[PDB]
Protein backbone atom coordinates (compact mmCIF):
# COMPACT_ATOMS: atom_id res chain seq x y z
CA UNK A 1 0.00 0.00 0.00
CA UNK A 2 1.18 3.50 -0.92
CA UNK A 3 -0.35 6.95 -1.40
CA UNK A 4 -1.62 6.29 -4.92
CA UNK A 5 -5.34 5.61 -5.35
CA UNK A 6 -7.89 5.08 -8.13
CA UNK A 7 -11.65 5.41 -7.76
CA UNK A 8 -14.22 2.74 -8.63
CA UNK A 9 -17.76 3.65 -9.74
CA UNK A 10 -21.04 1.79 -10.13
CA UNK A 11 -21.56 -0.23 -13.32
CA UNK A 12 -23.51 1.00 -16.32
CA UNK A 13 -26.69 -0.50 -17.73
CA UNK A 14 -25.46 -3.15 -20.17
CA UNK A 15 -27.62 -3.97 -23.19
CA UNK A 16 -28.09 -7.54 -24.41
CA UNK A 17 -29.70 -8.35 -27.76
CA UNK A 18 -29.80 -12.11 -27.16
CA UNK A 19 -31.94 -11.79 -24.01
CA UNK A 20 -35.14 -10.91 -25.88
CA UNK A 21 -36.82 -13.74 -27.79
CA UNK A 22 -39.84 -14.57 -29.95
CA UNK A 23 -42.97 -16.50 -29.03
CA UNK A 24 -45.41 -17.66 -31.72
CA UNK A 25 -46.24 -14.00 -32.29
CA UNK A 26 -45.01 -11.84 -29.40
CA UNK A 27 -41.95 -10.56 -27.50
CA UNK A 28 -40.61 -12.57 -24.55
CA UNK A 29 -38.10 -11.56 -21.86
CA UNK A 30 -36.53 -14.31 -19.73
CA UNK A 31 -33.93 -12.86 -17.34
CA UNK A 32 -31.03 -15.19 -16.51
CA UNK A 33 -30.83 -17.05 -13.22
CA UNK A 34 -31.06 -14.67 -10.27
CA UNK A 35 -31.08 -11.52 -12.42
CA UNK A 36 -33.27 -8.41 -12.56
CA UNK A 37 -33.70 -6.52 -15.84
CA UNK A 38 -35.27 -3.37 -17.27
CA UNK A 39 -37.22 -3.42 -20.55
CA UNK A 40 -37.93 -0.23 -22.52
CA UNK A 41 -39.63 1.20 -25.58
CA UNK A 42 -42.03 3.41 -27.58
CA UNK A 43 -43.44 0.96 -30.17
CA UNK A 44 -46.82 2.52 -29.47
CA UNK A 45 -46.77 4.53 -26.26
CA UNK A 46 -43.84 4.52 -23.86
CA UNK A 47 -43.25 1.51 -21.61
CA UNK A 48 -40.46 1.24 -19.04
CA UNK A 49 -40.86 -1.95 -16.99
CA UNK A 50 -38.72 -3.87 -14.51
CA UNK A 51 -38.68 -7.67 -14.26
CA UNK A 52 -37.34 -9.52 -11.21
CA UNK A 53 -36.26 -13.03 -12.26
Amino acid at each position, epitope marked *: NRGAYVEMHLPGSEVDSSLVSLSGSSVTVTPPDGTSALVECEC*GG*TKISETIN
Partner: nanobody
Amino acid sequence: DVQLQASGGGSVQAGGSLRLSCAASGHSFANYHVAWIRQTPGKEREFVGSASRRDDSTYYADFALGRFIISRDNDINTAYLQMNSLKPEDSAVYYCVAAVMAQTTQGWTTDYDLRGQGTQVTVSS
Protein backbone atom coordinates in the same frame (compact mmCIF):
# COMPACT_ATOMS: atom_id res chain seq x y z
CA ASP B 1 -51.01 29.37 -36.11
CA VAL B 2 -50.76 25.59 -36.42
CA GLN B 3 -54.25 24.49 -35.31
CA LEU B 4 -55.96 21.09 -35.36
CA GLN B 5 -59.70 20.88 -36.08
CA ALA B 6 -61.69 17.82 -35.00
CA SER B 7 -65.03 16.93 -36.57
CA GLY B 8 -67.28 14.01 -37.49
CA GLY B 9 -69.12 13.54 -34.20
CA GLY B 10 -72.80 13.49 -33.37
CA SER B 11 -75.57 11.51 -31.71
CA VAL B 12 -75.88 7.88 -32.84
CA GLN B 13 -77.64 4.85 -31.40
CA ALA B 14 -75.65 2.08 -29.75
CA GLY B 15 -74.15 -0.56 -32.03
CA GLY B 16 -73.60 1.73 -35.03
CA SER B 17 -70.49 3.42 -36.39
CA LEU B 18 -68.95 6.86 -36.84
CA ARG B 19 -65.87 8.46 -38.40
CA LEU B 20 -63.97 11.36 -36.81
CA SER B 21 -61.44 13.52 -38.65
CA CYS B 22 -58.55 15.65 -37.36
CA ALA B 23 -57.23 18.19 -39.87
CA ALA B 24 -54.21 20.47 -39.38
CA SER B 25 -54.11 24.03 -40.72
CA GLY B 26 -50.60 25.52 -40.92
CA HIS B 27 -48.48 22.35 -40.96
CA SER B 28 -48.85 18.80 -42.24
CA PHE B 29 -48.87 15.52 -40.30
CA ALA B 30 -45.73 14.27 -42.10
CA ASN B 31 -43.66 14.17 -38.88
CA TYR B 32 -46.32 14.04 -36.15
CA HIS B 33 -47.53 11.23 -33.92
CA VAL B 34 -51.33 11.49 -33.83
CA ALA B 35 -53.07 10.57 -30.56
CA TRP B 36 -56.78 10.52 -29.73
CA ILE B 37 -57.79 11.63 -26.22
CA ARG B 38 -61.31 11.23 -24.82
CA GLN B 39 -62.91 13.35 -22.08
CA THR B 40 -66.16 12.17 -20.53
CA PRO B 41 -67.94 14.69 -18.25
CA GLY B 42 -67.23 14.11 -14.57
CA LYS B 43 -63.85 12.38 -15.00
CA GLU B 44 -60.34 12.94 -16.40
CA ARG B 45 -59.15 12.75 -19.99
CA GLU B 46 -58.50 9.14 -21.01
CA PHE B 47 -56.25 7.78 -23.74
CA VAL B 48 -57.94 6.14 -26.75
CA GLY B 49 -55.34 5.35 -29.42
CA SER B 50 -52.25 6.59 -31.21
CA ALA B 51 -50.70 6.12 -34.65
CA SER B 52 -47.18 6.71 -35.97
CA ARG B 53 -46.11 7.25 -39.58
CA ARG B 54 -42.39 6.77 -38.90
CA ASP B 55 -42.75 3.09 -37.93
CA ASP B 56 -46.37 2.47 -39.05
CA SER B 57 -47.43 1.42 -35.54
CA THR B 58 -50.83 1.73 -33.86
CA TYR B 59 -51.55 1.66 -30.12
CA TYR B 60 -55.04 0.88 -28.82
CA ALA B 61 -56.36 0.94 -25.26
CA ASP B 62 -58.03 -2.00 -23.54
CA PHE B 63 -61.53 -0.80 -24.46
CA ALA B 64 -60.46 0.37 -27.93
CA LEU B 65 -59.06 -2.95 -29.19
CA GLY B 66 -61.15 -4.75 -31.79
CA ARG B 67 -63.47 -1.74 -32.27
CA PHE B 68 -61.40 1.32 -33.23
CA ILE B 69 -59.26 1.89 -36.33
CA ILE B 70 -56.87 4.79 -37.00
CA SER B 71 -55.74 5.86 -40.48
CA ARG B 72 -53.80 8.80 -41.90
CA ASP B 73 -53.88 10.39 -45.36
CA ASN B 74 -50.96 12.82 -45.58
CA ASP B 75 -52.16 13.97 -49.02
CA ILE B 76 -54.86 16.09 -47.33
CA ASN B 77 -53.02 16.22 -43.95
CA THR B 78 -55.86 14.58 -42.00
CA ALA B 79 -56.15 11.79 -39.43
CA TYR B 80 -59.20 9.51 -39.38
CA LEU B 81 -60.67 7.54 -36.45
CA GLN B 82 -63.12 4.97 -37.84
CA MET B 83 -64.89 3.23 -34.96
CA ASN B 84 -67.84 0.84 -34.76
CA SER B 85 -70.16 -0.95 -32.32
CA LEU B 86 -71.24 2.02 -30.23
CA LYS B 87 -71.75 1.56 -26.48
CA PRO B 88 -73.29 4.00 -23.97
CA GLU B 89 -69.93 4.50 -22.25
CA ASP B 90 -68.45 6.11 -25.40
CA SER B 91 -70.34 9.42 -25.02
CA ALA B 92 -67.64 12.09 -24.67
CA VAL B 93 -65.63 14.86 -26.38
CA TYR B 94 -62.62 13.83 -28.46
CA TYR B 95 -59.45 15.81 -29.20
CA CYS B 96 -56.50 15.08 -31.49
CA VAL B 97 -52.89 15.71 -30.43
CA ALA B 98 -49.87 16.00 -32.75
CA ALA B 99 -46.33 15.67 -31.36
CA VAL B 100 -42.85 15.42 -32.92
CA MET B 101 -41.72 12.23 -31.16
CA ALA B 102 -40.12 13.66 -27.96
CA GLN B 103 -41.28 10.47 -26.16
CA THR B 104 -44.59 12.22 -25.47
CA THR B 105 -46.73 9.05 -25.65
CA GLN B 106 -45.96 7.71 -22.15
CA GLY B 107 -49.24 6.36 -20.75
CA TRP B 108 -51.03 9.58 -19.93
CA THR B 109 -49.65 11.79 -22.70
CA THR B 110 -50.43 15.11 -20.97
CA ASP B 111 -48.02 17.03 -23.21
CA TYR B 112 -50.08 18.60 -26.03
CA ASP B 113 -47.45 19.85 -28.45
CA LEU B 114 -50.42 20.78 -30.66
CA ARG B 115 -53.85 21.17 -29.02
CA GLY B 116 -57.00 21.41 -31.13
CA GLN B 117 -60.72 21.90 -30.68
CA GLY B 118 -62.70 18.72 -30.08
CA THR B 119 -66.06 17.30 -31.11
CA GLN B 120 -68.83 15.75 -29.02
CA VAL B 121 -70.30 12.28 -29.60
CA THR B 122 -73.52 11.17 -27.90
CA VAL B 123 -74.59 7.52 -27.59
CA SER B 124 -78.27 6.62 -27.18
CA SER B 125 -79.09 3.20 -25.71
